[PDB]
Design an enzyme around this catalytic site. Structure first.
Site, mmCIF file in Angstrom:
data_model
loop_
_atom_site.group_PDB
_atom_site.id
_atom_site.type_symbol
_atom_site.label_atom_id
_atom_site.label_comp_id
_atom_site.label_asym_id
_atom_site.label_seq_id
_atom_site.Cartn_x
_atom_site.Cartn_y
_atom_site.Cartn_z
ATOM 1 N N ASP A 62 0.835 -1.192 0.000
ATOM 2 C CA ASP A 62 0.000 0.000 0.000
ATOM 3 C C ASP A 62 0.877 1.252 0.000
ATOM 4 O O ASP A 62 1.974 1.242 0.564
ATOM 5 C CB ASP A 62 -0.963 0.029 1.184
ATOM 6 C CG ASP A 62 -2.330 -0.528 0.842
ATOM 7 O OD1 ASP A 62 -2.439 -1.249 -0.182
ATOM 8 O OD2 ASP A 62 -3.307 -0.253 1.576
ATOM 9 N N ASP A 68 -2.489 9.056 6.431
ATOM 10 C CA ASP A 68 -2.218 7.794 7.111
ATOM 11 C C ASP A 68 -1.279 8.011 8.303
ATOM 12 O O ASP A 68 -1.607 7.592 9.410
ATOM 13 C CB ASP A 68 -1.590 6.771 6.172
ATOM 14 C CG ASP A 68 -2.609 6.140 5.250
ATOM 15 O OD1 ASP A 68 -3.757 5.954 5.700
ATOM 16 O OD2 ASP A 68 -2.246 5.843 4.093
ATOM 17 N N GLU A 91 -2.415 -1.198 10.957
ATOM 18 C CA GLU A 91 -2.150 -1.409 9.536
ATOM 19 C C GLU A 91 -0.842 -0.784 9.073
ATOM 20 O O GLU A 91 -0.166 -1.321 8.191
ATOM 21 C CB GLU A 91 -3.293 -0.826 8.703
ATOM 22 C CG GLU A 91 -3.054 -0.872 7.193
ATOM 23 C CD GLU A 91 -4.178 -0.182 6.425
ATOM 24 O OE1 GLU A 91 -4.176 1.072 6.352
ATOM 25 O OE2 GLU A 91 -5.065 -0.901 5.907
ATOM 26 N N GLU A 92 -0.468 0.355 9.650
ATOM 27 C CA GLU A 92 0.728 1.098 9.300
ATOM 28 C C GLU A 92 1.994 0.550 9.935
ATOM 29 O O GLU A 92 3.098 0.968 9.573
ATOM 30 C CB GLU A 92 0.561 2.576 9.713
ATOM 31 C CG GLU A 92 -0.579 3.282 8.992
ATOM 32 C CD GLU A 92 -0.699 2.946 7.521
ATOM 33 O OE1 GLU A 92 0.280 3.061 6.754
ATOM 34 O OE2 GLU A 92 -1.799 2.548 7.082
ATOM 35 N N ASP A 112 -7.016 0.171 11.937
ATOM 36 C CA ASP A 112 -6.725 0.830 10.672
ATOM 37 C C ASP A 112 -7.020 2.308 10.897
ATOM 38 O O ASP A 112 -8.199 2.671 10.970
ATOM 39 C CB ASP A 112 -7.569 0.179 9.582
ATOM 40 C CG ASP A 112 -7.389 0.768 8.201
ATOM 41 O OD1 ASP A 112 -8.077 0.314 7.263
ATOM 42 O OD2 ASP A 112 -6.565 1.694 8.039
ATOM 43 N N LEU A 114 -6.820 4.937 9.147
ATOM 44 C CA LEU A 114 -7.532 5.543 8.021
ATOM 45 C C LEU A 114 -7.711 4.487 6.928
ATOM 46 O O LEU A 114 -6.779 3.964 6.289
ATOM 47 C CB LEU A 114 -6.815 6.790 7.491
ATOM 48 C CG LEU A 114 -7.718 7.832 6.818
ATOM 49 C CD1 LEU A 114 -8.680 8.465 7.808
ATOM 50 C CD2 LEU A 114 -6.906 8.935 6.158
ATOM 51 N N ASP A 115 -8.988 4.134 6.737
ATOM 52 C CA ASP A 115 -9.267 3.139 5.701
ATOM 53 C C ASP A 115 -9.999 3.806 4.533
ATOM 54 O O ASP A 115 -10.881 4.623 4.799
ATOM 55 C CB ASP A 115 -10.084 1.971 6.249
ATOM 56 C CG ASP A 115 -10.282 0.866 5.225
ATOM 57 O OD1 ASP A 115 -9.392 0.017 5.035
ATOM 58 O OD2 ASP A 115 -11.355 0.844 4.594
ATOM 59 N N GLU A 274 -9.558 -4.898 9.653
ATOM 60 C CA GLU A 274 -10.587 -4.577 8.655
ATOM 61 C C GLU A 274 -11.710 -5.592 8.757
ATOM 62 O O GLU A 274 -12.838 -5.248 9.115
ATOM 63 C CB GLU A 274 -10.037 -4.519 7.228
ATOM 64 C CG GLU A 274 -9.180 -3.298 6.943
ATOM 65 C CD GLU A 274 -8.385 -3.357 5.658
ATOM 66 O OE1 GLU A 274 -7.732 -2.352 5.306
ATOM 67 O OE2 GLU A 274 -8.380 -4.399 4.981
HETATM 68 O O1 F6P Z 1 -10.046 -0.897 -5.302
HETATM 69 P P1 F6P Z 1 -10.529 -2.155 -4.611
HETATM 70 O O2 F6P Z 1 -9.657 -3.337 -4.954
HETATM 71 O O3 F6P Z 1 -12.015 -2.382 -4.787
HETATM 72 O O4 F6P Z 1 -10.258 -1.898 -3.027
HETATM 73 C C1 F6P Z 1 -11.348 -1.398 -2.239
HETATM 74 C C2 F6P Z 1 -11.048 -1.705 -0.789
HETATM 75 O O5 F6P Z 1 -9.691 -1.270 -0.474
HETATM 76 C C3 F6P Z 1 -9.670 -0.650 0.814
HETATM 77 O O6 F6P Z 1 -9.249 0.693 0.651
HETATM 78 C C4 F6P Z 1 -8.704 -1.354 1.750
HETATM 79 O O7 F6P Z 1 -7.349 -1.283 1.371
HETATM 80 C C5 F6P Z 1 -11.080 -0.752 1.374
HETATM 81 O O8 F6P Z 1 -11.419 0.407 2.101
HETATM 82 C C6 F6P Z 1 -11.953 -0.903 0.140
HETATM 83 O O9 F6P Z 1 -13.137 -1.636 0.429
HETATM 84 O O1 PI Z 2 -5.234 2.277 3.141
HETATM 85 P P1 PI Z 2 -6.380 1.364 3.383
HETATM 86 O O2 PI Z 2 -5.966 -0.035 3.134
HETATM 87 O O3 PI Z 2 -7.519 1.736 2.496
HETATM 88 O O4 PI Z 2 -6.834 1.483 4.804
HETATM 89 MG MG MG Z 3 -5.244 2.615 6.247
HETATM 90 MG MG MG Z 4 -7.187 -0.205 5.287
HETATM 91 TL TL TL Z 5 -5.693 5.290 4.015
HETATM 92 TL TL TL Z 6 -6.633 -3.525 2.872
HETATM 93 TL TL TL Z 7 -1.884 1.964 4.686
HETATM 94 TL TL TL Z 8 -4.602 -2.450 3.781
#
Ligand code: F6P
Ligand code: PI
Ligand code: MG
Ligand code: MG
Ligand code: TL
Ligand code: TL
Ligand code: TL
Ligand code: TL
Length: 331
Positions: A62, A68, A91-92, A112, A114-115, A274
């Site tokens: 990532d 983040d 996650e970081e 996480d 920031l997701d 997650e």
């Molecule tokens: O672009 P993709 O493969 O659909 O990834 C979406 C998923 O990735 C994430 O950012 C996690 O890394 C989730 O928040 C999200 O549901």
């Molecule tokens: O960065 P992420 O994997 O979306 O939390």
């Molecule tokens: Mg994150």
């Molecule tokens: Mg995430």
């Molecule tokens: Tl993020």
């Molecule tokens: Tl992820």
């Molecule tokens: Tl990250």
């Molecule tokens: Tl991730």
């Protein structure tokens, strides 16, 4: 108007008769502080110039956005200073973080900070995800303490930085939604004892991976578009931020999917910080959460950054998909 049911009061009254150290309340109060400061930063990230990358990579793959780093720092500092935690998984961070002896409490927190990375620059909804475990062991705190099945979660939830900022918190007795009041900086109860619909009419998945999907996912999607009984087809929705898609799944019902695929046996999302928290929320609201072959909360992890496939939402929708997987299952 002059009696505000804040998150703090709620968590406090909740664990009253069932007393306790009250370090859970300290825990959650600490977390709320960090969520408010993340919310404020995000609501003004372009002005403050918090868009873009920080210039670093994570564990398996990532790209590190500036937000983040900021949000990770916030969550870590407030958890540490809460005196309620001993082990933190972020996650970081490649390894679990061990809280110094003086500031240790009895909880393990997986998060996480920031997701929804891909959606940061386009101002789409993002969030913060957390799972909280009691440390069972008696030996010196360690990464092993974070390797518990989701079933052992004592509390889990997320902050959704959407059109409004919302703190969704699930505990042993159920799920409650708290909305940030920007004027007084308090999370206020707006939804109590939330239960997901038994069946919804929305399916959420990235069909861009159609080429990699397993026959079960392929059949299921086709069935949502061309219902065999001539019922109305399901509407599609894929915000692309797990916290947003799952929150909509919660209050509107339906299903959200990030399954395993030809190139990703274990899916993409992370089990610890997650899938488990969202699994737990889903199951406290009367929903289901599966890999397609087993309940997410029963998986016993071996890697804090371990990935899991996840299919969650209304029981009747998750179950219709389980039947398709069972139908396709081979030796
Ligand atoms: O672009 P993709 O493969 O659909 O990834 C979406 C998923 O990735 C994430 O950012 C996690 O890394 C989730 O928040 C999200 O549901
Ligand atoms: O960065 P992420 O994997 O979306 O939390
Ligand atoms: Mg994150
Ligand atoms: Mg995430
Ligand atoms: Tl993020
Ligand atoms: Tl992820
Ligand atoms: Tl990250
Ligand atoms: Tl991730």
């Amino acid at each position: 108007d002059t009696n505000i049911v804040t998150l703090t009061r709620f968590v406090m009254e909740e664990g009253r008769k069932a007393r306790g150290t009250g370090e859970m309340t300290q825990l959650l109060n600490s977390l709320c502080t960090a969520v408010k400061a993340i919310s404020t930063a995000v609501r003004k990230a372009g002005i403050a110039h918090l868009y873009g990358i920080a210039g670093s990579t994570n564990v398996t793959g990532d790209q590190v956005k500036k937000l983040d780093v900021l949000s990770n720092d916030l969550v870590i500092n407030v958890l540490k200073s809460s005196f309620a935690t001993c082990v933190l998984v972020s996650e970081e961070d490649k390894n679990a973080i061990i809280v110094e002896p003086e500031k240790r409490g009895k909880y393990v927190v997986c998060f996480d900070p920031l997701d929804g990375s891909s959606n940061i620059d386009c101002l789409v909804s993002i969030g913060t995800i957390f799972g909280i475990y009691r440390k069972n062991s008696t030996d010196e705190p360690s990464e092993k303490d974070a390797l518990q099945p989701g079933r052992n979660l004592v509390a889990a939830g997320y902050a959704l930085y959407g059109s409004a900022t919302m703190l969704v918190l699930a505990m042993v007795n159920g799920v409650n939604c708290f909305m940030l009041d920007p004027a007084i900086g308090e999370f206020i109860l707006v939804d109590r004892d939330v239960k997901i619909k038994k069946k919804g009419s929305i399916y959420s998945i990235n069909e861009g991976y159609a080429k990699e999907f397993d026959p079960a996912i392929t059949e299921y999607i086709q069935r949502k578009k061309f219902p065999p009984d001539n019922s109305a087809p399901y509407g599609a929705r894929y915000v692309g931020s797990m916290v947003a898609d799952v929150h909509r799944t919660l209050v509107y019902g339906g299903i959200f999917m990030y399954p395993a695929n030809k190139k990703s046996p274990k899916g993409k999302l992370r089990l610890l910080y997650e899938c488990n928290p969202m699994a737990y929320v889903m199951e406290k609201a009367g929903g289901l959460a599966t890999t397609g072959k087993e309940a997410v909360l029963d998986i016993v992890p071996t890697d804090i950054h371990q990935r899991a496939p996840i299919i969650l939402g209304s029981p009747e929708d998750v179950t219709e998909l389980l039947e398709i997987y069972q139908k396709h299952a081979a030796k």
